[PDB]
Amino acid sequence: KAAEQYQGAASAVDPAHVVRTNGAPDMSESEFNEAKQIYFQRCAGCHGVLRKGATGKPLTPDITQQRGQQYLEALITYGTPLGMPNWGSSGELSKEQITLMAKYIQHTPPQPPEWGMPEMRESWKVLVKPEDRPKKQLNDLDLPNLFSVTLRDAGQIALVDGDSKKIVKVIDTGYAVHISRMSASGRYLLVIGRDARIDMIDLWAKEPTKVAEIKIGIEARSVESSKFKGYEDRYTIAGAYWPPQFAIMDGETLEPKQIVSTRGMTVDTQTYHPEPRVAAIIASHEHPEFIVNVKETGKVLLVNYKDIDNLTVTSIGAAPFLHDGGWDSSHRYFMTAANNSNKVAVIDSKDRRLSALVDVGKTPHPGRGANFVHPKYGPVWSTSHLGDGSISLIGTDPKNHPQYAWKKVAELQGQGGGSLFIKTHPKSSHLYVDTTFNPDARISQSVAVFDLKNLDAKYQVLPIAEWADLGEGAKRVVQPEYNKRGDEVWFSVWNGKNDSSALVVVDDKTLKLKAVVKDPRLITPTGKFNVYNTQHDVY
């Protein structure tokens, strides 16, 4: 009873300021559930699970009830010129469904489940123990020139032989794999589904097979491996959208070791955000650390894994809505884009500080980017945009080019907006830019190609989808990617699940069609990752 009286006094919290949430329009289970289904299918991607993920005012009951039914129905029906699509005018949703959505967002957001160590360990599986694995490569494949291609809707990936242009093996994975990464030893391929399911693949088995799997959350986009000298295959890390966390696992068995929450304060307003989704992750070559991007809070965390028992993290403020990015030519400065902020943040992995914030076009989407030496400006890194058809060129040589370092030194103009990936190679004199989400069929079905030796000349349009000879469907082209020797560039013709897709290969030296990869198993091909170029960050 002593300790009971010790903790007996009243809380300093004032009961009058603790608020009960409600005042929302009544809706039955049937109604609420119908709206909820539409929300996660059509609205969650942008607005998040807790509805504070998009720009502008959140869809939380404090704001939505302020607006009212009529305002909400009207906004959902016609959308806004600032990124909010129209659901009524387009005919996507009915007025009955819209009335339900307006009522739905006036209620407290329903909570998805958490995903802690117990859930992770339960999902963890060692298919083949390290001891039972081969001591050397048991097949005669040219592993470095292998391509890990995502068979999105089929929940698989396919290993495609670079030179033979044929599928060597199809592997079952998590749903709609987002990216594929290579371990520092060049032996293990890591893939992560958008459902947060990771699969570890041993390229040395007679037939490349999975040796381990685990689920790190409910939804995720990124996975990465330790690339600092002396740590080959030591640790694997992955970022989840939900729950807002990232986990570190054993690089050899995928055993969950540490789980860290990213819920916290924003860089701009320094206010609390309950859903800071983890975006791009890149491994540092300067220190034994992982560079993790936190979207909504706009924070870049340097997670040191020299000692994972007592985790040391350095939090660098950048800019809101961090997404994708990649190394500069020297592999020291992490060029990442804060797309909704229309800026590119530059992270010095050596000094461990924000080198700069560069103003670019509308919604930068570099991917990993494209590096090359500009005649006039020296070493640069480039990115295309979703919001416009411009290409930003940024100086990345502070040491020998201080006049151009971290400055949007110049621009280029591609076919138009809706661009996703820009690309080049050290041995190439070409710069490729796609237009996957451009509203025009012809533009979305082709790629622009610039001449690095003559940047003043207009790009040449390569009819990628046309060359595929596939028939009907949107046939959107996406992410250009080089081979080991980078004497040929690959593209994906992302056609419908019930349509016909293909991989188109172009001779980089001549800009001529070289091969077209077709197979009934090649369903909804999206991302493609050459083993060598991915492992050694060649872009």
Between residues 73 and 434, which has the closer beta carbon with respect to ligand DHE? 434
265 binds Cl ion (CB under 5 A): yes
Binding site for ligand HEC (CB under 6 A): 4, 7-8, 38, 42-43, 45-47, 54-57, 59, 63, 67, 72, 75-76, 80, 82-85, 87, 101
Residues that bind its own copies (rule: CB under 8 A) add up to a total of 92
- Beta-strand pair 278-283/179-182: unpaired
Site residues for ligand DHE, 223-252, by CB under 6 A, read none
Burial degree of 96 (CB within 10 A; 0-12, 13-18, 19+): exposed
Query: Helix, strand or coil for residue 408?
Result: strand
Nearest distance, CB of residue 239 and its own copies, angstroms = 13
| 47 labelled ligand-binding | yes
Q: Which does 101 bind (CB under 5 to 8 A by kind): its own copies, ligand HEC, ligand DHE, none?
A: ligand HEC
Q: Considering only residues 14 through 73, tell me which ones interact with ligand DHE, judged by CB under 6 A.
A: 45
First to last CA, the chain: 67
Partner whose binding site includes residue 179, from Cl ion, ligand DHE, ligand HEC, none (CB under 5 to 8 Å by kind): ligand DHE
3-state secondary structure of 172: strand
- Give dist(CA 522, CA 112) in Å, integer: 33
Among 6, 96, 206, 270, binds ligand DHE (CB under 6 A): 6
**d(Cα 194, Cα 177) in Å, to the nearest integer?**
6
Q: Which does 272 bind (CB under 5 to 8 A by kind): ligand HEC, its own copies, ligand DHE, none?
A: its own copies
Of residues 274, 169, 226, the one with CA closest to residue 521: 169
The structure tokens listed for 263 are 């819920």
Query: Do the annotations mark residue 78 as ligand-binding?
Result: no
Would you call 118 helix, strand, or coil by DSSP? helix
> Can you point out the beta strands (E) in 452-487?
460-462, 476-482
The residues annotated as belonging to the active site are 43, 46-47, 84, 323, 365
Residues 467-506 that bind ligand DHE (CB under 6 A): 478-479
Residue located via tokens 């000298």: 229
Q: Alpha-carbon torsion 249, 254, 256, 261, what sign? A: positive
197 is in an annotated binding site: no
**Minimum CB distance to ligand DHE, residue 420 (Å):** 6
Closest distance to ligand DHE from the beta carbon of 293 (Å): 7
- Asked if residue 264 binds Cl ion (CB under 5 A), the reply is yes
222 is annotated as contributing to ligand binding: yes
Q: At what angle do helices 69-78 and 95-104 cross, to 10 degrees?
A: 130
- Cα dihedral across residues 61, 59, 277, 523: positive or negative: positive
Of 26-34, 79-87, 124-132, 274-282, the window that binds ligand DHE (rule: CB under 6 A) is 274-282
Size of the site for ligand DHE (CB under 6 A): 22
- Of 59 and 179, nearer to ligand HEC (C-beta) is 59
> Taking a C-beta distance cutoff of 8 angstroms, is the pair 233, 188 a contact?
yes
Specify whether the CB–CB gap between 318 and 302 falls below 8 A: no
**Residue 421 is encoded by which pair of tokens?**
């990936």
**Residue 527 near ligand DHE by CB under 6 A:** yes
String of contacts with ligand DHE for each residue 276-315, x by CB under 6 A: ---xxx----------------------------------
Compute the chain's Rg from CA coordinates.
Answer: 24
Q: Applying CB under 8 A, which part among 123-131, 162-170, 208-216, 411-419 lies near its own copies?
A: 411-419
Q: In this structure, are residues 243 and 262 in contact, taking their beta carbons and an 8 Å threshold?
A: no
Under a CB-based contact definition with an 8 Å cutoff, are residues 173 and 197 in contact? yes
Find the binding residues for Cl ion in span 234-263 (CB under 5 A).
Answer: 260-261
Q: Which residue has the tokens 């949430």?
A: 21
Which CB atom, from 109 or from 251, has the smaller least distance to its own copies?
Answer: 109
Strands 525-530 and 146-151, bridge-based pairing: antiparallel
Q: Is 111 in the site for its own copies (CB under 8 A)?
A: yes
Q: Name the token pair of 463.
A: 């009819």
Contacts with its own copies in 166-185 (CB under 8 A)? Answer: 175-176
DSSP 459: P
Q: Which residues contribute to the annotated binding site for heme c?
A: 43, 46-47, 67, 80, 84
Residues that bind ligand DHE (CB under 6 A): 6-7, 9, 45, 152, 176, 178-179, 194, 221-222, 279-281, 323-324, 367-368, 478-479, 526-527
Q: Which residues contribute to the annotated binding site?
A: 43, 46-47, 67, 80, 84, 178, 221-222, 241, 368, 479
Q: Which residues contribute to the annotated binding site for heme d1?
A: 178, 221-222, 241, 368, 479
